[PDB]
Amino acid sequence: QIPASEQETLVRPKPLLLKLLKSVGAQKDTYTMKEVLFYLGQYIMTKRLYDAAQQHIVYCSNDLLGDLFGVPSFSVKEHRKIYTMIYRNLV
């Protein structure tokens, strides 16, 4: 798991990340890490960036998510990885 204290740490997303979050319904300017993950998940669900056969695999080479995270792909199982890629898109 990832510690609860880290989950409810307040963060301010960079403009591109914020645009992504709001595009799926987020309304705020600052979020807890948990909230950020919630809306991020919605974005991935809508665009179906996951692999059909192995749905923990996310392909984002041709998506803005890939520009943000700076990777062609990642695993949903790799929680710490995801947190790190978020931490690099914060003001």
Binding site: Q1, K34, L37, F38, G41, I44, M45, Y50, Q55, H56, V76, K77, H79, I82
Partner: peptide, 12 residues
Amino acid sequence: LTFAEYWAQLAS
């Protein structure tokens, strides 16, 4: 698991 099921684990 489905994508939703994997992603939901981030909530706990």
